[PDB]
Paper text:
3D classification of the images resulted in seven distinct maps of the enzyme, each showing the complex in a different conformation. Initial 3D classification produced three classes, each of which appear to show a ∼120° rotation of the central rotor within the F1 region of the complex (blue arrows), similar to what was seen previously with the S. cerevisiae V-ATPase. State 2 could be divided into states 2a, 2b, and 2c, while state 3 could be separated into states 3a and 3b. In comparison, three different sub-states were identified for state 2 and consequently there are three sub-state to sub-state transitions that are possible for this state. Transitions between the three sub-states of state 2 show both motions: the transition between 2a and 2b shows mostly bending of the peripheral stalk near OSCP and F6 subunits, while the 2b and 2c transition shows mostly bending near the membrane-inserted portion of the peripheral stalk (respectively). The transition from state 2a to 2c shows a combined bending at both of these positions. Video 6 illustrates the extent of rotational oscillation predicted from the transition between states 2a and 2c. (C and D) The map segment corresponding to the c8-ring is shown for state 2a (pink) and state 2c (purple). The difference in rotational position of the c-ring is consistent with the Brownian fluctuations predicted for the generation of a net rotation. In addition to bending and twisting of the peripheral stalk and central rotor of the enzyme, the differences between the sub-states of each state show variability in the rotational position of the c8-ring in relation to the a subunit, even in the nucleotide-depleted conditions in which cryo-EM grids were frozen for this analysis. This lack of a rigid interaction between the c8-ring and a subunit is consistent with the Brownian ratchet model of proton translocation.
Author numbering:
A (entry chain H): 15 to 145
B (entry chain T): 1 to 58
C (entry chain W): 10 to 226
D (entry chain I): 1 to 47
E (entry chain P), G (entry chain O), H (entry chain N), I (entry chain Q), J (entry chain M), K (entry chain J), ...: 2 to 73
F (entry chain G): 111 to 219
The structure:
């Protein structure tokens, strides 16, 4: 099983809670680490975090970032820089953001800036996932 | 040990009754038959610790 | 007559003593005798019970009898000769119908048209496509059941070839042995790497298939 | 990705842009609450 | 010619088991690397390896039917 | 405060100092802030401990210390690399990420 | 000549099922490691496995259509 | 010799479809192990899978046109 | 016709072992790369490589018995 | 003899085009998993995939020229 | 015929060494990918690579035995 | 026989170009899935790809000279 | 027949160079995807690249020895 530790600095949602699996859009990938799982560090992308809680319930989240930390053990810890439950997120904006984003990227000359946009684009998109 | 000896005797009888067998082929398979035993006898000692203790426990 | 008649009784009797001896072990004696033999069904109830149930205790001993029977049946084609090429092949073919009927008992007997409705509704066979279901009923039974005969016949083969190549190798190098002994000593050890492994995994196929039967049963 | 990560950019920066983009995200008052997290005032002393 | 071409023709159809032979090592190989990623061994993963060895030996059983048609 | 109780010795050997260190409520954002550029520094990390007052209860804190091994060859090395089981990105980018977390934490403590 | 070369030439077309059988172990094996990273079992992944094996055994059914056209 | 060798000459060109048989399983199999990493399934990946399956059935459109030339 | 075609029948039946040898390299490679991810080596996974190297050689004993049938 | 074994010489030359067909899938399938790691589509990987499709179909061109040599 | 078909049969059995050759590359390639994941190079993983080159050359020595039997 | 079987012997020697064609697909595929990890495009990974496609078509030039010996 | 079969038998063993040429494509491929993981490029991996391409070209130099023996 997994002690799933789900937190952002700001909010701790599940804490070593007997969750079955979390499929995690780590920048690393989306993988569904169930239970324990070898030491691995995977850094959290923005995506949505789907917390297959050992009970057929899955809580939804958007994760923005952070890292999930994969112990060897059962306890797996998403420490998402930002992790929010999808509940509070905003399509009107998601699109809206995306438009803008896409507008900005274009002038966001230089990889970093572009990036910042792109990140953002990606972000809005990744919201757009859920939105 | 006694069981193994009986099995060998039976094999010989079957070969002697039935014609179909080259000296060669037999030489071989007979070397094959031999090999398995020796590994087994080191095992045949090793076996007992599990089973006789497991009977006693259950 | 006698030759064929003596072999099948012997095969039964070797399984009959374990199958009589274990029933006997339930109170006496044990001396050397009973406790020694208890180890036989302890190895079965140790080894195979690590996989069994699984499908449930209900089916477990039903399959374990066949699993032991297959390994014991192949072992009763090990020693005899002429026997591996003929009698063990007739026992491989004589296990063929039992292997065919093993899918029949619950699969084809209850559903011939789609024994994958008991075996596997969605998987290999397409549950949207009863055609692919039935095609692969061959590969999961009609086939694999005949290949499971061919599988022990593969062993009978590769075992026969060791023998014919050996007899031919020692006929080529009738040195007594001598240098042909080196290769032939390898060809002997190949009997373990080939027959004794693949014979194993051949009954492992019967294990898994009769597990997938009863595990979904 | 790497258009940022190999824009170098602190992982923090990434993250922080992400997160910031989350802050950017959110609905109504929820989005108000964004600013909490972006306590980031932290005067820039630097020796 | 009549007993010749059916004896050399039954040999060429036995080159269809080279597909099912290596096709069985891959489906049982990706199940070895899959259960390495863990942990749904019994059921789901190793229950699909039977569904992958059946659709691969189906072309083998289709090829072993051809070589036995020119042999008997 | 560490500014003349310490920025006056290591007022040089300091890498940064932050102000607004309290006196309006600091947050993770700040931890990231302080994190980010810190990386993007030229004093690269050799050793490292984080000393903060670890709260224990209002009544108590014990000025705590942690080790800071941002130096990504700590991460890249030892058994640590054997507990890794995945590359020098996330290594750094956790080393990073976690640094902010602790930074935050430690700070908050 | 007209019937002899029809029995040894229908055997060489049975070696074209070596691709449909080794390819099926690649279309199911890359689905075993695919659902190992998970989680879309029913739909998406296994649905794409069916549309892949159909495009793998199609070169086996067309090769058994050129086999049976040489013997029947 | 003339009509006899045209029968065991399109049968050896029918075993060239074993490359397209397993090549379609390697292409579609990689797409099943690609969309599992997610999420660019619609377009980008599955759209490129139609470019890889056409470039693998291209050798199948040149090998089946060879055996159909030695027929009629 | 009778003495010749049995020698060119067990020769093309030995081209079915081309899968039993490569498929064993596929399964034992996936156990070589699988044990790298660790840690079930002396159990679970290397006990599945014996069950894979057998099913691969299962079309390598079925093919070998046909080449031993055409000869003797 | 002169007209006979030239027809059975072009057919086995068409079996050398089984490497290009399975080579086309294993080269445009690794790029179907390359863009799955992203984002060099129409940049580096898809540009080298055409330089990988050319190096494999040339070994199909150097084999189809042998099949055309024994046909005209 | 009898002293002829022994040369057109012992050569077809050398095509069974195609699995022994491509099995040695796959078992060693995944050993080169398994030792790239680190760290048990000295025994455990490269030790098992010897137990993978043996169970892959065995289907190449049994195929070379049948080719040598039809030549001498 | 003499001016016949050499024309059907150059067809069987051109089947060795199924390894130089499917070896290029395996080589120029892992240097496309490896460059996806980045950023050793020039000087390292693609430079080793020149030494990867040098020992791949080396078995094909040795197979194109074997067919050239059975023609000229 | 006595002079005919040697020519047809030399080409048949030249088809066994399709396994060595793809086994070199897998060993050098998994070294190209084994150097992207970094960093011991010199020694360890690419030093075992010639040690993995030696046992895989060992099946080709033995096969091209059986192809040359039927020619000289």
């Amino acid at each position: 099983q997994m002690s799933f530790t789900f937190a952002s600095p700001t909010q701790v949602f599940f804490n070593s809670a007997n969750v079955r699996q979390v499929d995690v859009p780590t920048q690393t990938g989306a993988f569904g680490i169930l239970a324990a799982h070898v030491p691995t560090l995977q850094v959290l992308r923005p995506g949505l975090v789907v917390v297959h809680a050992e009970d057929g319930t899955t809580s939804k989240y958007f994760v923005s970032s952070g890292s999930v930390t994969v112990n060897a053990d059962s306890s797996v810890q998403l420490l998402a820089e930002e992790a929010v439950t999808l509940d509070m997120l905003d399509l009107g904006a998601a699109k809206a953001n995306l438009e803008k984003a896409q507008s900005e990227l274009l002038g966001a000359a230089d990889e970093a800036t572009r990036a910042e946009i792109q990140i953002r684009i990606e972000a809005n998109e990744a919201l757009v996932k859920a939105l | 040990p006694y069981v193994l000896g009986t099995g060998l005797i039976l094999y010989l009888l079957s070969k002697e009754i039935y014609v179909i067998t080259p000296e060669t082929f037999s030489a071989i398979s007979t070397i094959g038959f031999l090999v398995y035993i020796v590994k087994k006898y080191g095992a045949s000692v090793g076996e007992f610790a599990d089973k006789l203790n497991e009977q006693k426990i259950a | 007559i006698t030759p064929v008649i003596l072999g099948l009784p012997l095969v039964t009797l070797i399984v009959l003593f374990p199958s009589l001896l274990f029933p006997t072990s339930n109170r006496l004696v044990s001396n050397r005798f009973v406790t020694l033999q208890q180890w036989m069904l302890q190895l079965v109830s140790k080894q195979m019970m690590s996989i069994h149930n699984s499908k449930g205790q209900t089916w477990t001993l039903m399959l374990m009898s066949l699993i032991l029977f297959i390994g014991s049946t192949n072992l009763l084609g090990l020693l005899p000769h002429s026997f591996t090429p003929t009698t063990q092949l007739s026992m491989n073919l004589g296990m063929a119908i039992p292997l065919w009927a093993g899918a029949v008992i619950t699969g084809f007997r209850n559903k011939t048209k789609a024994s994958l409705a008991h075996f596997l509704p969605q998987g290999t066979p397409t549950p949207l496509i009863p055609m692919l279901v039935i095609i692969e009923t061959i590969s999961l039974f009609i086939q694999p059941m005949a290949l499971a005969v061919r599988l022990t016949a593969n062993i009978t083969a590769g075992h026969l070839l060791i023998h014919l190549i050996g007899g031919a190798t020692l006929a080529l190098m009738s040195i007594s042995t001598t240098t042909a002994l080196i290769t032939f000593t390898i060809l002997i050890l190949l009997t373990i790497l080939e027959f004794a492994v693949a014979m194993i995994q051949a009954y492992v196929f019967t294990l898994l298939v009769s597990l997938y039967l009863h595990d979904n049963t | 990705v790497a258009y940022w990560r190999q824009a170098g950019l602190s992982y923090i920066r990434y993250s922080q842009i992400c997160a910031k983009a989350v802050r950017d995200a959110l609905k109504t008052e929820f989005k108000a609450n964004a600013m909490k997290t972006s306590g980031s005032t932290i005067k820039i002393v630097k020796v | 010619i009549d007993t010749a071409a059916k004896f050399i023709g039954a040999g060429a159809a036995t080159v269809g088991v080279a597909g099912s032979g290596a096709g069985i090592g891959t489906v049982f190989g990706s199940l070895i690397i899959g259960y390495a990623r863990n942990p749904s061994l019994k059921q789901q993963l190793f229950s699909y390896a039977i569904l992958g060895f059946a659709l691969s030996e189906a072309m083998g059983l289709f090829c072993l039917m051809v070589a036995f048609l020119i042999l008997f | 405060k560490i500014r003349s109780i310490l920025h006056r010795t290591h007022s040089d050997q300091f890498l940064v100092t932050f102000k607004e260190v309290g006196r309006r409520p600091p947050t993770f954002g700040d931890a990231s802030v302080i994190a980010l550029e810190l990386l993007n520094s030229g004093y690269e990390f050799d050793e490292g401990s984080i000393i903060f007052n670890r709260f224990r209860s209002v009544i108590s804190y014990k000025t705590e210390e942690k080790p800071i091994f941002s130096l990504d060859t700590i991460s890249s090395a030892e058994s640590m690399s054997i507990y890794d089981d995945i590359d020098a990105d996330v290594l750094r980018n956790y080393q990073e990420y976690s640094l902010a977390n602790i930074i935050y934490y430690s700070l908050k403590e």
